Amino acid sequence: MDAKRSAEALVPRFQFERLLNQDQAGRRSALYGAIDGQPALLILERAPFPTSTAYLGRAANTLRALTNLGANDIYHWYLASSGVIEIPVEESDDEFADLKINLIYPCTEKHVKKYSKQGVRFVTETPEIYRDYVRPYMQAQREAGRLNWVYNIIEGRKEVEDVIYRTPYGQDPEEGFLLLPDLNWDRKTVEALHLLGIVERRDLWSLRDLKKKHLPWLRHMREKLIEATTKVYPTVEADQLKLYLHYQPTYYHLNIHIVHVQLEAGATQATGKAVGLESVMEQLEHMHVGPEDGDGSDVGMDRVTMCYTLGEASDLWVDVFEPLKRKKQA
Amino acid sequence: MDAKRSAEALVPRFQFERLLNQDQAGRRSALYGAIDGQPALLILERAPFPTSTAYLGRAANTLRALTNLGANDIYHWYLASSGVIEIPVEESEGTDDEFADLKINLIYPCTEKHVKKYSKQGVRFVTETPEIYRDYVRPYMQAQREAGRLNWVYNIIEGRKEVEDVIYRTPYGQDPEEGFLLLPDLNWDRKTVEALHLLGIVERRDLWSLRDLKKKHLPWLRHMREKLIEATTKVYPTVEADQLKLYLHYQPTYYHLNIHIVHVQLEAGATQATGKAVGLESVMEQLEHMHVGPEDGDGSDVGMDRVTMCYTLGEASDLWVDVFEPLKRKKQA
């Protein structure tokens, strides 16, 4: 393993310059620097704790340093440094690791931008702002071809082996769908289940397109997605799943997240990003039908004001909401 | 300093028995065991990385072990173990300290209450129709209030408790309808502005949860939204209005309306998750556009008690044990 030793030789040559970002409760730091006089990006992460009893049964008894910070009755808190614990013969001479390291070298300005801290803003999207600015932006993104990757999966030309369930392409153009594992799921831990329900029809760009006339479709899709998930993973019951939509979505083709209720909630589930599927259905169900609205078929989410988070490097913040904010402050 | 050394002697005597829970993306493990023949609960946490240049400028060059797992062009990924890095004199009160990679909490002797608190808990997603709210859940809320479970809230509202922890309030009694106070969330260190998490406890006592909100409350809601934001940005001048999110819990942990205020940069966890957190503006918009029927008059009493709400419950909670699990059991063949 010359390439393995070669890659290992890079890390001690890293010359730190500055911290780009620290996140994940402080347990991930993105460092910028240089190796051999060229830009280098080194990402430090605390590793998860081992579950081996060889580790858990020895961690408290092998510390290389331990400092009590305070105590109150039966409560005590400390800082400590891990000692060396060797991995037993039947699980590996290795020791248990406390760090994960990613090194991008040589890195570019694109990597610096990607891993630099990005501020977040909470914006207010009225029906007028959706009509005049956001919906035109969505259209341009789709016309530019940004959904090619989605369409390639829907049509069965990519990630065929990653799909865990689908209706065959073309068999059901209105209510067909496929289930894709989320990139961060190990596909083995059922209680961390996270699937993407990508619908086959192509005319719904986001929940903004949903109207009362889509309530039957929404009911059918909710049942079908839950039915398929609990069929593929039979130890999962219906009341152990949550279905939600993103707004703003990360891409402009309606897709329904399916997560196990036991999955640790992160940004993908947070208020200002995730909207429960049943919550959208109830808003359509009870939305007011005015005298000019006929039977109500076209009453829907494009009448609502939606408030949500955006990153400050996003197109929508830079081109729409920051300028609207500046124009209002003048 | 003797008590400091005494508490340090506890940790190496810990005898591991079993893992109670591992969460926070695997970086927190709650271990159950014994010390001196009595139950002990040891919680291991990965520490945040120092920002000190003395640490960051040496971490890559002092590793005590390093294994490359793979590489692809300019991408390389590894596992590693940290070496010893001493804290420089100008950053340490003591001498011969090294940067720490672990935080440890030891509860000893612990009880069954601590084991329950830190053990993994099953979760269920339930469907609360208006009928189930009427027949089962609202009576449960009422009994909780009648039992006195809100004594702690009222003690703070009335200025008998946590007077020193309130970061802002309207003086009690001055504004009975739109008065409020702001309390820091127990999990916030009260100094890191980008992790800000406040609880807005309203002065009025007749709103138990968002189920009580109706169209007639929309002016009150608009006013409270503004007032909570103005007060937060007044106390924390580096926070702008568009760097805050306001939300309600449903189910809430207690049955007196209270509005969470969080910095947009705060990392989202269970408290913000779908099935628990409901954005304040989302409730207001749901009330704004809700249908007013022919028997509803001017619509003033149309509100959230007409909606079906879906949310998560823990399997040890009263509502699961006494309401939703029995309803589920009776329905199943």
Residue numbers in the entry:
A (entry chain A): 1 to 92, 96 to 333
B (entry chain B): 1 to 333
Please quote the authors directly:
In the 3′ to 5′ pathway, the mRNA body is processively hydrolyzed by the 10-component cytoplasmic exosome complex (exo-10; exo-9 plus Rrp44/Dis3), followed by the removal of the cap structure of the remaining short RNA fragment by the Scavenger Decapping enzyme DcpS (Dcs1p in yeast). The apo DcpS decapping enzyme assembles into an 80-kDa symmetric homodimer that contains dimeric N- and C-terminal domains that are linked by a flexible hinge region. The enzyme possesses two bipartite active sites that are located at the interface between the N- and C-terminal domains. Upon substrate binding to the C-terminal part of one of the active sites, the N-terminal domain flips over to enclose the mRNA substrate in a well-defined pocket.
Next, we aimed at determining whether this preference in substrate usage is a conserved mechanism, and we focused on the enzymes from Chaetomium thermophilum (a thermophilic filamentous fungus) and humans. The protein crystallized in space group P1 with one dimer per asymmetric unit. The structure was determined by molecular replacement and refined to a resolution of 1.95 Å with good geometry. DcpS forms a symmetric dimer with the same overall fold as the human and mouse protein, indicating that the fold and domain orientation of the protein is conserved despite a relatively low sequence conservation. The C. thermophilum and human apo proteins show a single set of peaks (black contours), which confirms the findings from static crystal structures. Upon addition of an mRNA substrate with one nucleotide (red contours), the C. thermophilum and human enzymes undergo a transition into an asymmetric conformation, thereby forming a catalytically competent active site. On the contrary, an mRNA substrate of three nucleotides does not result in the formation of the closed conformation (blue contours). From these data, we conclude that the length sensing mechanism that we identified in the S. cerevisiae protein is conserved in the C. thermophilum and human enzymes.
